[PDB]
Design a protein around this nucleic acid. Structure first.
Lengths: 151, 63
RNA sequence: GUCAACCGAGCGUUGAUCCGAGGAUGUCCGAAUGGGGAAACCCGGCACGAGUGAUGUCGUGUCACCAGGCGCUGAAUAUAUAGGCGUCUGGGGGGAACGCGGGGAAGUGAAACAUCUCAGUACCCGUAGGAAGAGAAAACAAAAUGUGAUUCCGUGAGUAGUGGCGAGCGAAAGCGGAGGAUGGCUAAACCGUAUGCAUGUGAUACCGGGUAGGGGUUGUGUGUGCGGGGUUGUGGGACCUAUCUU
RNA sequence: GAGCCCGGUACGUGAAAACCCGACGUCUGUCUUGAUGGUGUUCCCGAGUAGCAGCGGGCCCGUGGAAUCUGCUGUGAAUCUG
RNA sequence: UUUGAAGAAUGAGCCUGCGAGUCAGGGACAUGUCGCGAGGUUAACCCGGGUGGGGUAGCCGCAGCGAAAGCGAGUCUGAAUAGGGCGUAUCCACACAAGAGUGUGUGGUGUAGUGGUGUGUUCUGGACCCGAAGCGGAGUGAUCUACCCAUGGCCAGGGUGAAGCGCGGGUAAGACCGCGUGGAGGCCCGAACCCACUUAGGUUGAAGACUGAGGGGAUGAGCUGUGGGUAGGGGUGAAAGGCCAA
RNA sequence: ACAGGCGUAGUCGAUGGACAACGGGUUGAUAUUCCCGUACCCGUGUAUGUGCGUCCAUGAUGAAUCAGCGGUACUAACCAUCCAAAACCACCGUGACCGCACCUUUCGGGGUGUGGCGUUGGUGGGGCUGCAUGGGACCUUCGUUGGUAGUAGUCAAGCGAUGG
RNA sequence: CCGGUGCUGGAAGGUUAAGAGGACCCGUUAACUCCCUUUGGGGGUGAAGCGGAGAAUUUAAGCCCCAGUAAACGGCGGUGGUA
RNA sequence: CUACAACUUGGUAUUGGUGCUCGAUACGGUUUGUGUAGGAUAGGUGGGAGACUGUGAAGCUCACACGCCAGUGUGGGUGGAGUCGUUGUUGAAAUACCACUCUGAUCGUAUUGGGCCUCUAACCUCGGACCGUAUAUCCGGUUCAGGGACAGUGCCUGGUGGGU
RNA sequence: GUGUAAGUGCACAAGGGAGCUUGACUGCGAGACGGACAUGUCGAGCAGGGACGAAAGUCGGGACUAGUGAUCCGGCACCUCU
């Protein structure tokens, strides 16, 4: 079982290393916990490993950061471009958590991951302005207004 | 504990042969282990029985 | 109608009784399926009607479970899943033989008996069909420049063999026939496109040449889906590159 | 104990309707934005598969020198000078 | 059926019906008859409303010996023409050697098989017919009986008088003793009820397990109704190999 | 493996629980059923009043709040504590091992370790403090009292469970 | 009475399966090394690869072994003389 | 007698990490070599006429090792300018120098397994708490708390085996 | 007295002693005995190569009759077989 490390693991290696390890280790500890990815294709895995290592370090949050992120979420609305028909007012495709996250990061500035945005609860499969709740912490939450503009 | 929920493996039937060549019926049971399958990386585990061949091939994801 | 007549009543040339084909009605039990149950008998809900001074009462529908689609909802719990709803399509049971895949004895013969035979028989399970299974060489063959998918008959042959070499068991190659479809379609490598997950030196990159415009056929990746591309054994096919071109 | 008495037979005729077989068209799909024959290299040709090992099944073949086919448990390759 | 049965060995009450060497296969051996004859014959299949016509793939005969390579009227063994084994259909004539039984050569004669089909035995089939105790597969049964579970019911009548409590005695308190209430008990006698020890009858019975006289228990480990459960190498068993529909 | 085995939610199952009728007469045959006399138990409608209410109004005055007190109260910690968390030490015992002491086999060996540690370990000691434990009690939270409007709520006939 | 057979407890040795190990040997032939005949066959060595048998070293329980156990199954003897 | 159920042993799969601790082979090295003729505990060998030196030798005081107590190898200080060549022996030359190296003891780089102490994520819990859920000691899910790569279960294998 | 039970034999010796030696062979075998079959027994003689003997000749174990086990399956060596 050959797998490429994403984070740094003691006694094993650093990020980007391709290691062969007992299949029990990869299946139950590294891969499920997101500490590595399977080594199957160099062009994909190396690029994916680089993206994963940067994403984990850039999307981390602390208790103090969560409070700071709560204030930073007080900015204006965020617009989403989606393919849809203007006659009905309902979307062809489905807004995904990456689409919301990529919208806020490129426009607002805060860096978040898909794991926290509450999307299905808002039922945004339509055209208009909808409020989206974001849970930054077990006790701390945030609300972001979302405006959806059809194609 | 003899039928895998994924590949549908079955216990092969055969005859146990003694020194005196007395043929006695027996079965060859698949190695079927209990596994907590994580269908979606979100992390809700469901309990199923999977053959050790399917585990090795990576047909079930324990995340 | 009949055993099967006797009485009483009627129909028929304006076509009866009869025979054929298609409709309507079809109580109750039965997979039985609204709930229940000692099968053919008890008790209902909902909607629409009928009926009483009103309860009682009567008709017509409809109400099981599971699977799969589809739309809403998304618990502990955050993403979300389980699950809950509503709605459409399916199943369930029966049948004499024949098929296919599983499980699989004993009496018996061996002049006892365990290996073996009886026998993969009896029986059991799951399943279709009008037939099923098999089928288009990772096949035979033996130096012949031979055959050319499968299936089914006749031979090969009770032979080669196998067997406490005991009882017994028992091929195939080849050859002669039945049928004709030596039939078809894919996956990969490449392209185009739509995406999902990433990211971006977010620029000198993505299109064949040249002129120029541009900063996203994303710049790069990747996976998935879909259209071309290809189905071959004297190997074939992708890329590459020369000649003609309905 | 019937060819000439009756039902029939030989031989002809008969379908409103339903069903089944054909046949001719609407209709459906495909080729024409396409084919023919040539030259020298990189990529592809079905993976936990093939192969090997342990225990069995079945083939004339009772594990035998035991090939081919196949089940379960491990181990586990190449893509055509394969 | 017996060495031997009229036998006091077996079977038959009588009559009439019914009741036992058959069939399949190009099977094996033998023997008749028919066709062709160094040849005989087809199987599957095709064409005919038929029993007819076609069908050369195979089989038998035609050369043997040897494990086999192989050789071939010879061959095997063998160092050997040196003997032996198997074979050259058989017979006739003539020569040559022996008279250890005759042998070798020449010449002539020339070789008989195979397809039906009748019959007798035989092979695989249940194989002349009737007949076990028991063996395996799948099911049916606890309405009888064993045990258990839930819920009900029943036990006439009459005795004995436990603990406790009270009084008196006793004592310092006690121990304990007498008299009163009380009414315990797998206690007593005894009907219903449940059993079944003795005897007599029955014994082609009234009854496929009873009756008449006596008999044991009879407030308990009691008897009984209703509904339910345990199933065959299994159940149940205060245990006898008992009970699980005579 | 297949066949199927158990079983939750429920739904069945009287031999039990709950529930309202007695006497007399009559036919050839039925009677607590028919008839006669007198009762009882579920529902429905009409009419008559009694008869309380919702709006309306009565009672509706009065409950919540602002604060204080006074400590529940994580927090930090303290009063600190049951036990001894964990190591410390020693005694005993001896894991191996090292010469040797012993049993020794009659004598020697040889093992053991009666020895050196030490730790198979055990036993005990006190502290290190830990273990958990609350409280006193701090923000917090709330109770009480002092106002804040007898002001905002509340509230009233009657049915009332599938729940206690 | 703990010898026998069980049961319980203890391994210091001996024996002991699978699985690990692959020494040595054999089958095959790349390349050689000898030849014998005249229009290519007969002897030896033989690397690598692929195979066939495979040994030494390892290894568990058990058994052999040492104790206890009879309200465990069980056993509880003969001969001669002698006041 | 031959089998089978059941119990039991070990290997391997599910099955993972860090640590010590070994045992094997491979690597960067040292070490040791008691035939005699002798400067004398003669590696066989190819390079061999020149090497170690002040990034500090002969000679002494000590550490440790083996010891065939015949002596070597080595650390430090001291010292300070040498030991050395066919040098003649001897089948075999130098302890002048360089390359693999074997009889054998060593360390660090690899691999492989063995034993032991650990950890949490596989796996397990009829331990708690919540949800599906109105009712549920079923079941599944989330989480906490404990075990923990053991156990359980496949495949291979040795035992016990009138229980059938 | 004859290796050994009993019988038939043996004084011509088959009994006692001495010298050499391995016929305690290879390939065969006319003709017979006895028998259900399977086994069992005698065999003159031919060839090769030997022993003793001058030679004739004798020798394919022992004075004779007991001292042994079919077939299947498998081991070892050789062969100009597949």
């Amino acid at each position: 079982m050959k797998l490429i490390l994403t984070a740094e693991v003691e006694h094993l290696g650093a990020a980007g290393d391709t290691v062969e390890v007992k299949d029990g280790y990869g299946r139950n500890y590294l891969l499920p916990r997101g500490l590595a990815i399977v080594a199957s294709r160099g062009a994909e895995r190396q690029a994916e490993e680089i993206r994963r290592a940067r994403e984990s370090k850039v999307i981390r949050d602390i208790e103090h950061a969560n409070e700071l992120k709560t204030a930073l979420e007080g900015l204006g609305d965020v617009t989403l471009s989606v393919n849809a028909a203007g006659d009905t007012g309902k979307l062809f495709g489905s807004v995904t958590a990456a689409d919301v996250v990529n919208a806020i990061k490129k426009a607002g500035g805060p860096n978040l991951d898909k794991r926290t945005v509450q999307l299905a609860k808002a039922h945004i499969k339509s055209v208009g302005t909808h409020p989206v709740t974001v849970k930054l912490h077990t006790g701390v939450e945030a609300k972001v207004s979302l405006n959806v503009v059809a194609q | 504990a003899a039928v895998c929920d994924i590949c549908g493996k079955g216990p092969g039937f055969g005859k146990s042969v003694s020194h005196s060549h007395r043929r006695t019926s027996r079965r060859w049971n698949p190695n079927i282990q209990p596994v907590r399958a994580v269908t979606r990386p979100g992390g809700n585990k469901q309990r199923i029985n999977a053959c050790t061949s399917c585990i090795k091939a990576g047909k079930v994801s324990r995340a």
